[PDB]
Amino acid sequence: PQITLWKRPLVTIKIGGQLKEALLDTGADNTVIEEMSLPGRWKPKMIGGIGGFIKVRQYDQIIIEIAGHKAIGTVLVGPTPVNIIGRNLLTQIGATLNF
Amino acid sequence: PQITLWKRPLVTIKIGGQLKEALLDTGADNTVIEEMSLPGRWKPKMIGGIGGFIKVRQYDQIIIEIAGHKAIGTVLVGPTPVNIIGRNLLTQIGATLNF
Numbered sequence: 019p020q021i022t023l024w025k026r027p028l029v030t031i032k033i034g035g036q037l038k039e040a041l042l043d044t045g046a047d048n049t050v051i052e053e054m055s056l057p058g059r060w061k062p063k064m065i066g067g068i069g070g071f072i073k074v075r076q077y078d079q080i081i082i083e084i085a086g087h088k089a090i091g092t093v094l095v096g097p098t099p100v101n102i103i104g105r106n107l108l109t110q111i112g113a114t115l116n117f
Numbered sequence: 118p119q120i121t122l123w124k125r126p127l128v129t130i131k132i133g134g135q136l137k138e139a140l141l142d143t144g145a146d147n148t149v150i151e152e153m154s155l156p157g158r159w160k161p162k163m164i165g166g167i168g169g170f171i172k173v174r175q176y177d178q179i180i181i182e183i184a185g186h187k188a189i190g191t192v193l194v195g196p197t198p199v200n201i202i203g204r205n206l207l208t209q210i211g212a213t214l215n216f
């Protein structure tokens with residue numbers, strides 16, 4: 019698709035068996051999802067934005083379906099106000115910014 | 118241009134006759150720049166990011182060049198970690214997300 023930016027670029031994702039809404043976010047290095055369980059190992063991380071930092075759990079090699087496109091990568095889980103698909107997964111579905 | 122996302126989508130902006138670097142950020146509703154002087158009156162605004170809320174100064178109808186494209190619109194000034202170009206100006210330069 020071609021997604022305009024008059025409104026937030028929200029899409030449906032599937033992660034850990036669950037359907038969620040998430041923001042396609044070119045300003046995010048990393049993918050950050052609201053608290054949920056995921057399988058496998060994790061390690062703690064701090065990530066920072068407007069407002070400061072939050073502590074997250076870093077899960078590696080997680081499969082995510084993003085508007086019908088499968089990708090794998092690292093997913094951070096923690097108290098983000100919104101689910102964010104960052105560049106680490108946008109690259110894998112071939113997303114570009116065009117103007 | 119068609120900008121891929123393997124690296125941060127940083128562009129040159131020009132505001133108040135000065136060049137700065139800024140991040141093209143589809144996850145930002147608003148454009149937020151680091152402290153600088155801008156003409157005119159400002160109004161209060163609170164914006165919520167990953168770590169919580171901050172107060173910013175809202176300046177309307179500011180001339181700003183983005184990657185060589187002319188925009189005139191709202192610029193928020195405050196303690197953002199990076200200059201961010203949000204959807205209010207990404208729409209003005211005709212940007213879309215494509216995959």
Ligand SMILES: CC(C)CN(C[C@@H](O)[C@H](Cc1ccccc1)NC(=O)O[C@H]1CO[C@H]2OCC[C@H]21)S(=O)(=O)c1ccc2c(c1)OCO2
Nearest residue numbers: 045046047048065066067068100144145146147165166167
């Ligand atoms: C601030 C930029 C450099 C980084 N952020 C991504 C943004 O797209 C963020 C994504 C975001 C969106 C909504 C709520 C929280 C974060 N948007 C945001 O802060 O926008 C603010 C300005 O416009 C307003 O509209 C949205 C909130 C305001 S982020 O959420 O802090 C973030 C995401 C993933 C990360 C990261 C930081 O560090 C490493 O991986």
Ligand SMILES: [Cl-]
Nearest residue numbers: 090091092106
């Ligand atoms: Cl990754």
Ligand SMILES: [Cl-]
Nearest residue numbers: 109112121122
């Ligand atoms: Cl590519």
Ligand code: NA
Nearest residue numbers: 058059078079
């Ligand atoms: Na893992």
